[PDB]
Amino acid sequence: SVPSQKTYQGSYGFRLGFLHSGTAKSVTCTYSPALNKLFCQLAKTCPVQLWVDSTPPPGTRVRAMAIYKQSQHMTEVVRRCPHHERCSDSDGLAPPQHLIRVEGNLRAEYLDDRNTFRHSVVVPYEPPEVGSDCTTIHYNYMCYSSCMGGMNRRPILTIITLEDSSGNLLGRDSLEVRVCACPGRDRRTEEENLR
Ligand SMILES: [Zn+2]
């Protein structure tokens, strides 16, 4: 099977938002609206905003999962490569095999689906704080898109779903992600190629 990637705002008007970081050669994370693609360095903070028109119920959660973008690779579980899964860089909560981690949230839970074998990380949805209009989750990608034996240069999509306490779908959004050495340069090159 393959997780759905269909955009769905749902009853709460759920959608993602990204900061405007630019494309300076030194940038560590940058999002391209034209390509709906996030470019980031290995294990660097990727701020992802959660926007809703109305607050969902207490117990609502937010899950992140990666899948290969190419249809011929969609059924393959996206996981860290043979080298990174063994580098003992766990933060004490994320299994070393997981590509996507959530930073600074002790309530993050990591799932290895007993049926699909796919990996995901989920946190409780927290409503915006005083003075804020949105909620931000900080993600880290733990392998480069080019890692051999892992993503192996194949592009991936990250699917973010808003779920109820039972795991039922409330909202869904997604974006392509490239983990690379120079996000600014690659974003500039890909947007140029699109033009
Ligand atoms: Zn790797």
Side-chain angles (χ1 to χ4, degrees):
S1 67
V2 178
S4 174
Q5 68 182 77
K6 169 71 172 303
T7 297
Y8 174 56
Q9 285 207 1
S11 306
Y12 301 99
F14 176 75
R15 71 280 190 175
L16 305 175
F18 301 85
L19 298 181
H20 297 278
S21 311
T23 57
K25 185 185 176 183
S26 67
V27 75
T28 61
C29 181
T30 186
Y31 175 74
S32 170
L35 297 164
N36 182 210
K37 187 168 181 174
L38 177 73
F39 297 76
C40 61
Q41 296 185 325
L42 175 68
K44 293 299 211 302
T45 301
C46 296
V48 176
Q49 302 174 332
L50 304 187
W51 292 89
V52 295
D53 291 328
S54 51
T55 309
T60 296
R61 294 206 299 175
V62 183
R63 184 182 301 282
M65 178 189 287
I67 60 166
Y68 281 112
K69 176 183 179 184
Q70 293 162 292
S71 59
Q72 65 265 44
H73 294 300
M74 286 214 177
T75 62
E76 186 178 323
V77 171
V78 175
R79 58 168 62 261
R80 294 180 82 190
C81 71
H83 163 61
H84 284 115
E85 77 169 0
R86 299 183 64 239
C87 66
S88 307
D89 61 4
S90 176
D91 67 339
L93 183 53
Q97 299 97 321
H98 287 224
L99 178 66
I100 305 174
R101 297 184 183 175
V102 166
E103 288 191 80
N105 190 321
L106 295 176
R107 289 190 299 168
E109 292 184 27
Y110 291 80
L111 175 73
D112 274 73
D113 197 285
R114 62 190 64 180
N115 284 165
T116 68
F117 300 114
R118 290 187 189 278
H119 302 165
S120 59
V121 59
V122 57
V123 294
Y125 168 79
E126 298 159 353
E129 321 176 65
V130 171
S132 287
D133 291 327
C134 69
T135 292
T136 302
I137 295 179
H138 293 92
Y139 292 106
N140 289 163
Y141 288 80
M142 308 303 299
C143 255
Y144 286 109
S145 287
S146 64
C147 282
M148 293 309 284
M151 288 182 278
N152 222 83
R153 299 180 254 69
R154 297 173 294 177
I156 58 165
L157 255 28
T158 288
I159 299 167
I160 303 295
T161 52
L162 187 67
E163 310 178 332
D164 64 19
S165 64
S166 287
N168 298 302
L169 180 73
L170 295 182
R172 186 188 299 111
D173 200 345
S174 65
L175 63 157
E176 177 173 346
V177 175
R178 172 180 177 67
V179 187
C180 52
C182 313
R185 178 196 64 192
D186 288 355
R187 173 173 167 200
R188 264 155 40 217
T189 300
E190 292 188 34
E191 297 191 339
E192 181 46 41
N193 289 5
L194 171 68
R195 191 187 69 68

